[PDB]
């Protein structure tokens, strides 16, 4: 009851009892042919964009508020998919995201894993503006805080308002999955391309945001490990660019 999956020259292993969320019922696909027939011809890499990219693990401790990543540009240094971001003026893609934990039966805790489109964030100063570095750091995660933040140009990252001004118990409206250390330790989310235009430039726009948020904190006792590792793996799907010839 273990499946082994190979994309390109990558191989990972999952359990065949996985559960998969397809975001709004829609699988990813190519914009078919004839939105812009004449002088808008696209191309597709399909070479080493369809392959598993694995980020660094994060460390879940007793007081961890949460983590977030921006897509794309979490992959702007990831081999070929990142090269294509510099060579081409427009693009699009869907994604498959796997999130996994490594824990024992003597640990306990609960995580929400959610993919949020257009996650526009607020500044720590009400009459201020957010910086580009405070929104993302690429393949390194940003951190939520457990109290309200200060300083100039920083996202106001108190975890109960999720940086967007809503109640964090209501983020289940988005494509999401629960990880309860008692019953499962994995989550797969398949995201299609969602925009109000068919293609776009991939450097000054963040299509979506992946967030991981503990709702019940990690607990252990006498001589268990004091942390739990979380691992994120991403495979781009049906990527497509403007033709160069």
């Amino acid at each position: 009851r273990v499946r082994s999956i190979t994309l390109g020259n990558s191989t990972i292993t999952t359990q065949e009892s996985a559960n998969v969320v397809v975001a709004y019922g829609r699988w990813p696909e190519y914009l078919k042919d004839n939105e812009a027939t004449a002088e808008d011809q696209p191309t597709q890499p399909d070479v080493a964009t369809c392959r598993f990219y694995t980020l660094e693990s994060v460390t879940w401790e007793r007081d961890s508020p949460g983590w977030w990543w921006k897509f794309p540009d979490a992959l702007k240094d990831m081999g070929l998919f990142g090269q294509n971001m510099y060579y081409h003026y427009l693009g699009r893609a869907g994604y498959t995201i796997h999130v996994q934990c490594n824990a024992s039966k003597f640990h306990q805790g609960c995580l929400m894993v959610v993919c949020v489109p257009e996650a526009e964030m607020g500044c720590s100063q009400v009459d201020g503006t957010v910086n580009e570095h405070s929104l993302s750091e690429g393949e390194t995660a940003k951190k939520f805080a457990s109290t309200s933040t200060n300083g100039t140009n920083t996202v106001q990252s108190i975890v109960t308002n999720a940086g967007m001004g809503v109640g964090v118990g209501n983020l289940t409206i988005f494509p999401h999955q629960w990880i309860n250390l008692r019953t499962n330790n994995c989550a797969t989310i398949v995201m299609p391309y969602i925009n109000n235009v068919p293609m776009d430039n991939m450097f000054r726009h963040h299509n979506f945001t992946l967030m991981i948020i503990p709702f019940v904190p990690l607990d252990y006792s006498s001589d268990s490990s004091t942390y739990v590792p979380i691992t994120v793996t991403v495979a781009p799907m049906c990527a497509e660019y403007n033709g160069l010839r």
Partner: peptide, 11 residues
């Protein structure tokens, strides 16, 4: 993570 990999959950 940016290359070919598998994530292995031993639980």
């Amino acid at each position: 993570m940016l290359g070919t990999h598998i994530i292995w959950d031993v639980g």
